[PDB]
From Swiss-Prot:
Changing residue 40 to A: Decreases catalytic activity to 13 percent of wild type. Catalyzes the 2 serial methylation steps for the conversion of the 7-monomethylguanosine (m(7)G) caps of snRNAs and snoRNAs to a 2,2,7-trimethylguanosine (m(2,2,7)G) cap structure. The enzyme is specific for guanine, and N7 methylation must precede N2 methylation. Hypermethylation of the m7G cap of U snRNAs leads to their concentration in nuclear foci, their colocalization with coilin and the formation of canonical Cajal bodies (CBs). Plays a role in transcriptional regulation. Residues 1-211 are annotated as: Sufficient for catalytic activity. Disulfide bonds: none annotated. It is found in: Cytoplasm; Nucleus, Cajal body; Nucleus, Nucleolus. The gene is TGS1. It comes from the Eukaryota. It comes from Homo sapiens. This is Trimethylguanosine synthase. Ubiquitously expressed. High expression in heart, skeletal muscle, kidney, liver and placenta. S-adenosyl-L-methionine binds at residue 86. Transmembrane segments: none annotated. N(7)-methylguanosine binds at residue 133.
């Protein structure tokens, strides 16, 4: 048991599913507490990367809140050039380690920085958004409000992302207000949504914007 894992009872279910999180976990994958709670399970990340490499111009993608690299790794495996951004230097170190384990570190440029302040000066074909939702407690809300229950504010993250591109992918809680999420598209805006499942269990949603 890793120190983070042994330290807390609530991390036991993430450890149990370590291979659903990273298939190559035993090849030296590392995460911290928040990393465990937040990492996109591999099958879901692979699915999202597949859809992106299908329906969008897909050369350069910004992973704006890259965490431990769950999504970043999957984008890189499809051959997209990724700009991976996280405000936490520890996450960047973890993500860099995990990308190497998967043999695609060279496909990625890592930035420790605040996406909110970088966005206006970034250029890319696709922006992928997997922000903090407020830890595991996010689920205790009957309906997740992306404006009031998310920091940074979900509409603000989207507005800044729009400076970069119209092709935006938003990774969001399974109890997210779907009316709210859809409204991000604005007037006449295009949006398609999917529920992401792991073993027939509802996990999260992903919204695909632009065309
Ligand atoms: C808290 N959180 C969770 N996730 C993702 O959502 C998944 C499910 O997280 P979960 O916390 O809902 O677990 P479970 O699905 O086991 O549900 P629970 O016991 O009812 O609470 C995690 O595997 C992550 O992929 C998260 N993803 C992002 N991007 N940000 C987050 O803050 C975040
Ligand atoms: N303002 C900001 N800019 C960039 N990253 C931020 C940020 N605020 C928080 N973060 C980072 O956003 C991340 C949310 S969790 C991301 C998980 C990722 N999709 C995975 O697959 O692993 C956290 O790691 C947090 O450190």
């Amino acid at each position: 048991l890793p120190p983070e894992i042994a330290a807390v009872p609530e991390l036991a279910k993430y450890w149990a599913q370590r291979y659903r999180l990273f298939s190559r976990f035993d090849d030296g994958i590392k995460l911290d507490r928040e990393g465990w709670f937040s990492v996109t399970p591999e099958k879901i990340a692979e699915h999202i990367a597949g859809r992106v490499s299908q329906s969008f111009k897909c050369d350069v993608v910004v992973d704006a809140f890259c965490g431990v690299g769950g999504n970043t790794i999957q984008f890189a495996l499809t051959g997209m050039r990724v700009i991976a951004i996280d405000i936490d230097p520890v996450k960047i170190a973890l993500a860099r380690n995990n990308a190497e384990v998967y043999g695609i570190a060279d496909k990625i440029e890592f930035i420790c920085g605040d996406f909110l302040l970088l966005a206006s000066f970034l250029k890319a074909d696709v922006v992928f958004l997997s922000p903090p939702w407020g830890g595991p407690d996010y689920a205790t809300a009957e309906t997740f409000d992306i404006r009031t229950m998310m920091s940074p504010d979900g509409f603000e993250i989207f507005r800044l992302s729009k400076k970069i591109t119209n092709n935006i992918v938003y990774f969001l809680p399974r109890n997210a207000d779907i009316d709210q999420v859809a409204s991000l598209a604005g007037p006449g805006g295009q949006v398609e949504i999917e529920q992401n499942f792991l073993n027939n269990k509802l996990k999260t949603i992903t919204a695909y914007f632009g065309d």
